C-alpha cells in the first residue's frame, strides 16, 4: 500500500487499468462514474503532453493539473484549482517536486541519492513539525528517530558518491553540522569513518579531479 500510494502520487494514470475502470468503480459506480453525460466541448488530443511525463512536472495546481488543461474553464474554477486551495499533502508533494526538478538526472527518476537524502530530510522535518504541536505521539517519535537515522545514511552515501551536490544541499539550507559524530568515546576509535569502509564508499572520490595525487 505505501508503494501504491506513492506510485499514484508520482504517476498520473497508474491507477486506471486497460479496462478504463479502476477498482473503486467496480463496487461503487454511483460515486466514481460521472452522473451527468454532458455534450459540451469534448476536448481533443493533448498535443502538449510531452511537457509533463510525471506529476512533479506540474505542481502549481490541484491534482497536478497542467495549465493547458484549464484553458477554457471559468476563473472561479481556476481559483478553486489554484495553489491556495491545495491540501497539505499535495503541498508537501510540491515541496518534494521542487527538489526532484533540481536534482533528478532523468524523467521518472525518483530514487537518485541526492533526491533520496532530500526526501528523507523533508519527511524528518514533517514529523518534527508534527511533534512540535503534539509532543505526546510515541509512534511519531519512533518514526522520527528512524527517519533521522535513514537521513544520516542517505547524506553519508551522497557525500562520497556525489560530493558537489552534498555540499550545495548543506550550504543552501543552513544546516552544516548535520553529519556529526554522536559520541567522542567511539569517534576516538575511527568508528565514525570505518562506516565508509564498511559501506563501500572508501575509494570513491577520483583524486585527480580534486587534487593532483603526485
Amino acid at each position: 500500500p505505501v508503494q501504491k500510494k506513492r506510485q499514484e502520487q508520482m504517476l498520473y494514470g497508474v491507477n486506471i487499468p486497460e479496462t478504463r475502470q479502476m477498482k473503486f468503480e467496480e463496487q461503487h459506480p454511483l460515486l466514481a462514474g460521472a452522473l451527468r453525460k454532458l455534450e459540451g466541448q469534448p476536448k481533443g488530443f493533448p498535443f502538449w503532453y510531452r511537457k509533463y511525463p510525471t506529476r512533479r512536472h506540474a505542481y502549481e495546481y490541484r491534482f497536478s493539473i497542467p495549465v493547458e488543461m484549464l484553458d477554457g474553464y471559468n476563473d472561479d474554477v481556476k481559483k478553486a484549482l489554484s495553489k491556495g486551495m491545495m491540501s497539505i499533502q499535495e503541498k508537501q508533494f510540491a515541496q518534494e517536486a521542487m527538489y526532484m526538478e533540481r536534482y533528478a538526472e532523468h524523467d521518472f527518476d525518483t530514487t537518485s541519492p541526492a533526491v533520496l537524502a532530500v526526501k528523507r530530510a523533508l519527511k524528518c522535518r514533517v514529523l518534527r513539525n508534527h511533534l512540535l504541536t503534539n509532543p505526546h505521539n510515541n509512534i511519531i517519535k519512533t518514526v522520527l528517530a528512524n527517519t533521522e537515522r535513514k537521513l544520516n545514511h542517505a547524506l553519508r552515501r551522497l557525500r562520497k558518491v556525489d560530493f558537489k551536490k552534498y555540499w550545495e544541499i548543506i550550504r543552501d539550507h543552513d544546516v552544516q553540522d548535520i553529519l556529526q559524530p554522536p559520541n567522542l568515546v567511539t569517534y576516538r576509535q575511527g568508528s565514525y569513518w570505518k562506516y565508509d569502509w564498511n559501506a563501500g564508499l572508501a575509494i570513491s572520490t577520483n583524486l585527480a579531479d580534486v587534487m593532483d595525487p603526485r
Binding site: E39, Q41, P42, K43, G44, F45, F47
Partner: protein, 107 residues
C-alpha cells in the same frame, strides 16, 4: 476538422495514417498537423505516433530529393550527401537507430 472536434469524433490510427499518406510535402503535412491542433480533435497515442512518423518520413524524403537534385550538377555525391545517407534526418521522435521504441504503442 471543426465539425469533428465539436462532435467529439475520435480519429482512428488507420484514418490518420491514410490521411497523412495522401500528403506530398513536409510543409503540407505540417499545415495539416497544425490544423488538427488548432481544432480540438481527438485521437489515440498510436495515431499521434503514426502522424509523427509520417512527418519524419516526409522530411527524410524532402532532404533526399534535395541531395539528388544537387548530385547531377556536382557529378558526384557530396560528403554531406553520404553522411545524410548514413545518419539520416537528425533528432526525431522516432529514430531508426533506436528500433526498440514504439513497440508498446504500435500493435
Amino acid at each position: 476538422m471543426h465539425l469533428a472536434g465539436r462532435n467529439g469524433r475520435e480519429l482512428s490510427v488507420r484514418t490518420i495514417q491514410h490521411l497523412f499518406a495522401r500528403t506530398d510535402s513536409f510543409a503540407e503535412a505540417l499545415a495539416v498537423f497544425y490544423t488538427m491542433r488548432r481544432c480540438h480533435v481527438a485521437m489515440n497515442m498510436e495515431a499521434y505516433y503514426s502522424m509523427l512518423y509520417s512527418l519524419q518520413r516526409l522530411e527524410e524524403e524532402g532532404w533526399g530529393q534535395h541531395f539528388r537534385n544537387e548530385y547531377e550538377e556536382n557529378g558526384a555525391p557530396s560528403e554531406q550527401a553520404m553522411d545524410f545517407i548514413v545518419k539520416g534526418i537528425s533528432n526525431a521522435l522516432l529514430p531508426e537507430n533506436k528500433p526498440w521504441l514504439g513497440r508498446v504503442m504500435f500493435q
